[PDB]
A paper describes a structure:
Saf pili are often found in clinical isolates of Salmonella enterica. The saf operon is located on Salmonella enterica centisome seven genomic island, which consists of four contiguous genes encoding the major subunit (SafA), periplasmic chaperone (SafB), outer membrane usher (SafC) and minor subunit (SafD). Saf pili are assembled by the chaperone-usher (CU) secretion pathway. In the DSE step of Saf pili assembly, the N-terminal extension (Nte) of an incoming SafA replaces the chaperone G1 strand (in SafB) via a zip-in-zip-out mechanism, giving rise to a remarkable polymer of SafD-(SafA)n (n > 100).
The structure of SafDAA-dsc was determined to 2.8 Å resolution by X-ray crystallography. The SafD, SafA1, SafA2 and SafA3Nte have assembled into a thread-like shape with 26 Å in diameter and 136 Å in length/height. In ASU, three SafDAA-dsc molecules with an extended ‘I’-like or a curvy ‘L’-like architecture can be observed. In the ‘L’-architecuture, SafA2 swings ~26 Å upward with its central axis in 90° angle with the rest of the structure. Structural comparisons among SafDAA-dsc structures show that: (1) The overall Ig-fold of SafD and SafA subunits is strictly conserved; (2) The relative orientation between SafD and SafA1 is also conserved. In between SafD and SafA1, Pro20 adopts a cis-configuration, enabling a kink in the subunit-subunit linker loop that, in turn, allows the formation of intra-molecular hydrogen bonds. In comparison, Pro20 in between SafA1-SafA2 adopts a trans configuration, allowing SafA2 moving freely away from SafA1 as observed in ‘I’- or ‘L’-like architectures. Three SafDAA-dsc molecules form two sets of dimers (i.e. the Type I and Type II dimers) in a parallel head-to-tail configuration. Consistently, the structure-based mutations, which target the dimeric interface and the proline reisdue (Pro20) in LoopG-A, consistently disrupted the self-associating activity of SafDAA-dsc.
Author numbering: 21 to 145, 156 to 297, 299 to 441, 447 to 466
The structure:
Amino acid sequence: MAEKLQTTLRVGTYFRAGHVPDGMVLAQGWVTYHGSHSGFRVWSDEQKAGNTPTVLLLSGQQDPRHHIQVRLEGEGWQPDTVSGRGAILRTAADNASFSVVVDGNQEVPADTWTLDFKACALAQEPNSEQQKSVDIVFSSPQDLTVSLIPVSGLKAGKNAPSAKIAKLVVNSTTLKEFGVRGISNNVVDSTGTAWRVAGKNTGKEIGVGLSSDSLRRSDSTEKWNGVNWMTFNSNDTLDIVLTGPAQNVTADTYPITLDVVGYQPDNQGSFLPNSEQQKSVDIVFSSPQDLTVSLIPVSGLKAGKNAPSAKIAKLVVNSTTLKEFGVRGISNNVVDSTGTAWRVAGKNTGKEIGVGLSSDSLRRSDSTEKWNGVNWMTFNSNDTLDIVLTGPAQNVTADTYPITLDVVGYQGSFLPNSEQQKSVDIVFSS
């Protein structure tokens, strides 16, 4: 005696909030009743006014003040004047079709509207009905607001394990969940939660991905056109870190790029591509600087006859942590063993001058030590040394002379290799 109706009801997924044309199908449905009957009736509890019994006004979930108006259509369906609620079909065919459709050209905001409606059969001149709830979703690019923040002050060289390199924060008041994948020529896990990135200048690769604690905040893993996506509750934060063991990172800028899409869960989940956002930020791995080094050219040098030991440049090696540093000139022709005097060629003329530490600036050196088989004159840091025209008076052609130093920190009879090379130009002027 208990034989009951069978509805199928397929809703749309890709609805973009905004303007919708009247007649736009939102759902398609079929009812199937095999017993004795003379028609079908589908109706709602969300109905509008007793005289338009086909029309429905729907209040949104995110905020009940959002409104969409729909109507029960179908070929052969006419309004149920008898009840005042719903639409009726007349046929003894066991199977009939019907559509739900926006009524009136409207502007629909971004929300989800529950459309719970009811279906039953009519006997030959109540029996057993079916009830279904189902959500229409309208989505917009602004549904979830995303922010990807690069971490400040990373240093090159070997980094800490799982070093935090970005922060993804996703917020939303419309959508309940979101999925995220990296975008890279080289992803290394099925879910796109770990990939590799090339530095813009070097081309060297680092391995990045989601932190071990961000991965555990995922509600589920979904397929979307064959690709695995991890899903997360919106209004949460995921951390992008340096995956795997501790990396040795070349000093460079690395671009990480994320694919973020809204997800509407359902025990039948769907992704909302209208809500999708891709964002890219640059992560800077700067090189670590034990020795702050400032080399500054003297200003107002003029071509022609110059003074013996005339000051050309001033170098100041300031270190907050290390006391003694060594120094050498870099050139194709150094004139003494210690590397403290050498010769520099003009860019435009290519004629050279003799530059070097001033005699006064020498013998402020603590010692002279051996590193790499070459000798370095050590000094005390936070002292300032001056570069000068070495030896006799010099007649310098007006040109720009690139001076280049090589400084290393030393004290302890060893030299730590955060040596730096800095190079300024010196201008002579007719």
